[PDB]
Design an enzyme around this catalytic site. Structure first.
Site, PDB file in Angstrom:
ATOM      1  N   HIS A  89       0.804  -1.219   0.000  1.00 14.94           N
ATOM      2  CA  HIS A  89       0.000   0.000   0.000  1.00 14.94           C
ATOM      3  C   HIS A  89       0.837   1.269   0.000  1.00 14.94           C
ATOM      4  CE1 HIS A  89       0.990  -0.856   4.162  1.00 14.94           C
ATOM      5  NE2 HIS A  89       0.722   0.402   4.468  1.00 14.94           N
ATOM      6  N   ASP A  97       3.007  15.270   4.812  1.00 11.21           N
ATOM      7  CA  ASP A  97       3.640  13.955   4.887  1.00 11.21           C
ATOM      8  C   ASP A  97       5.050  14.057   4.309  1.00 11.21           C
ATOM      9  OD1 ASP A  97       0.686  11.909   4.095  1.00 11.21           O
ATOM     10  OD2 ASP A  97       1.373  12.831   5.964  1.00 11.21           O
ATOM     11  N   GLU A 182      -3.877  -2.596   6.515  1.00  8.79           N
ATOM     12  CA  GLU A 182      -4.900  -3.239   7.329  1.00  8.79           C
ATOM     13  C   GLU A 182      -5.954  -3.940   6.468  1.00  8.79           C
ATOM     14  OE1 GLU A 182      -4.606  -0.141  11.173  1.00  8.79           O
ATOM     15  OE2 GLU A 182      -6.029   0.271   9.550  1.00  8.79           O
ATOM     16  N   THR A 338      -4.828  -3.410  17.691  1.00  7.34           N
ATOM     17  CA  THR A 338      -4.298  -2.110  18.084  1.00  7.34           C
ATOM     18  C   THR A 338      -5.172  -1.458  19.179  1.00  7.34           C
ATOM     19  OG1 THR A 338      -3.639   0.056  17.190  1.00  7.34           O
ATOM     20  CG2 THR A 338      -5.584  -0.983  16.216  1.00  7.34           C
ATOM     21  N   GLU A 376      -0.715  -3.398  18.960  1.00  5.51           N
ATOM     22  CA  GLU A 376       0.119  -2.210  19.066  1.00  5.51           C
ATOM     23  C   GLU A 376      -0.666  -1.062  19.691  1.00  5.51           C
ATOM     24  OE1 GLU A 376       0.290  -1.553  14.860  1.00  5.51           O
ATOM     25  OE2 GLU A 376       1.718  -3.198  14.554  1.00  5.51           O
ATOM     26  N   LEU A 379      -1.781   5.331  19.125  1.00  3.97           N
ATOM     27  CA  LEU A 379      -1.180   6.643  18.992  1.00  3.97           C
ATOM     28  C   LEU A 379       0.068   6.776  19.858  1.00  3.97           C
ATOM     29  CD1 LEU A 379      -4.614   8.424  19.434  1.00  3.97           C
ATOM     30  CD2 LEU A 379      -3.432   8.085  17.247  1.00  3.97           C
TER      31      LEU A 379
END
Length: 491
Positions: A89, A97, A182, A338, A376, A379
């Site tokens: 991806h 970014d 994901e 997560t 995980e 944030l």
């Protein structure tokens, strides 16, 4: 019989860009320093995204694995293991970014002539970050289907990295199954205006998915059923839409059919690609895994809107996760979740966020299906409160003094190695975190000691029909959770 059996391994994600868009491992010296600091903390390993957009950039089957080989070499030298993500991806692409890596240009070139290879929303916007599940088996990429691309990619990886795989460096292969790697639909794109806690939007309007659905409803006896046209837009709240409001279309026969078909595509998508993964890494001493998205907003209302548009048909009377776990069973894969650090009280009340309950459900569903579950933090967090919440989820019922814990996650990967994390005060608490995760035991170099020995990957078990998979939708009570961990960082 020893506390060491309560030991939960901790991994740290490497920052993006370690290997840049030009396939260059730009800063070995800087990384080595950071990796050695991670060693001082007793961290077990690291996780890295092996970007498809970097590797097969030149053209079809033109792979370049050198930069990554150099990265792997350094990791091995620093005494850490590694979790490798097959990232099919896009990276970045949004204003601000810094690390921007789209999927291979030659694939995008094909997209210019066939826009339907991208996930599409009702207004017709094309998301270019991943190939729609609709083209998984369409031989339109210079003769290859999307899955064949993923399959050849993983096969090339195993062969060229055969030495790192045999020496025990690479211990986990996380197969990316969608945006952000994901297994989901790009239901909440920042690029299209989405903002938390918007319900997001369905992404099944590309020509391929839109044809499969129409054939499906026709076979169900309702040829006239159409894709959702009352689900509103990205930033709407549930009650303002005809689809998610009470007595809305989502509890209608057609609505239920659509949601079932929609979420079903994800189950088959993951199952088929994992088939290729088992073949590719067959015999290697490595575990297989997938990443499930944590859509915690709207989990507290009956319609679970955000989850539904994401492709997880999860309601209070229908488990939309246990089926995924069941699907992972035959592949012996790990469900990597997560939100492990989040507490409901940290989210805005208007978001109806239930991360704590979501985690408890997903994890319990995994253990109920007898698969391993990892996770995980969602944030970046550096405080003791976040760590203690993670530790709670790691061993929800505490530690077993002279035996293995009644329940425990297979391991957790901490979000991003960063200058902030390495900052002395922050690193000090992070180190207490690893200690507790390790159940007060020192770092343990041999996983076998705490029952994490890795054996040769076996062929995936017999295919499980969709009906048996969907039997897991039957609601179940989650395992009881402790109110707080018995192993918290004193802070």
């Amino acid at each position: 019989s020893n506390m060491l059996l309560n030991y939960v391994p901790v991994y740290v994600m490497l920052p993006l860009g370690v290997v840049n868009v030009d396939n260059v491992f730009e800063d070995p010296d800087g990384l080595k320093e950071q990796l050695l600091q991670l060693r001082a903390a007793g961290v077990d390993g690291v996780m890295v995204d092996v970007r498809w957009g970097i590797i097969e950039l030149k053209g079809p089957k033109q792979y370049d694995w050198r930069a990554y080989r150099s990265l792997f070499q350094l990791v091995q030298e620093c005494g850490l293991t590694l979790q490798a993500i097959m990232s099919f991806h896009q990276c970045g692409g949004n204003v601000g970014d810094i690390v921007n890596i789209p999927i291979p240009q030659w694939v995008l070139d094909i997209g210019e002539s066939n826009h339907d290879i991208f996930y599409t929303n009702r207004s017709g916007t094309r998301n270019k970050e991943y190939l729609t599940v609709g083209v998984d088996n369409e031989p339109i990429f210079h003769g290859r289907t999307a899955i064949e691309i993923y399959s050849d990619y993983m096969k090339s990886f195993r062969e060229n990295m055969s030495d790192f795989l045999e020496s025990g460096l690479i211990i986990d292969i996380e197969v990316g199954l969608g945006p952000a790697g994901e297994l989901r639909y790009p239901s909440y794109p920042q690029s299209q205006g989405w903002e938390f806690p918007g319900i997001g939007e369905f992404q099944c309007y590309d020509k391929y998915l839109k044809a499969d659905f129409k054939a499906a409803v026709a076979r169900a006896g309702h040829p006239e059923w159409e894709l959702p046209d009352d689900a509103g837009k990205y930033n709407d709240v549930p009650e303002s839409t005809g689809f998610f409001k009470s007595n809305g279309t989502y509890v209608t026969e057609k609505g239920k059919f659509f949601l079932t078909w929609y979420s079903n595509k994800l189950l088959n998508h993951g199952d088929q690609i994992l088939d290729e993964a088992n073949k590719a890494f067959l015999g290697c001493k490595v575990k297989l895994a997938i990443k499930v998205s944590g859509i915690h907003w709207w989990y507290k209302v009956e319609n679970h809107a955000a989850e539904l548009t994401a492709g997880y048909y999860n309601l209070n009377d229908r488990d939309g996760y246990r089926p995924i776990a069941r699907m992972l069973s035959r592949h012996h894969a790990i469900l990597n979740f997560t939100c492990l650090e989040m507490r409901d009280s940290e989210q805005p009340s208007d978001a109806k966020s239930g991360p704590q309950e979501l985690v408890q459900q997903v994890l319990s569903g995994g253990w109920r299906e007898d698969i391993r579950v990892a996770g995980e933090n969602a944030l970046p967090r550096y405080d003791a409160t976040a760590y203690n919440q993670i530790i709670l989820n790691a061993r929800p019922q505490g530690v077993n003094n002279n035996g293995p814990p009644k329940l425990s996650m297979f391991g957790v990967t901490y979000l991003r190695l960063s200058d902030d994390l390495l900052q002395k005060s922050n690193f000090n608490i992070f180190k207490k975190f690893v200690l507790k995760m390790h159940a007060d035991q020192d770092y343990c170099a041999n996983p076998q000691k705490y029952n994490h020995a890795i054996t040769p990957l076996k062929p995936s078990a017999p295919k499980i029909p969709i009906e048996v998979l969907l039997e897991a939708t039957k609601p179940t009570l989650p395992f009881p959770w402790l109110p707080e961990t018995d192993m918290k960082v004193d802070g």
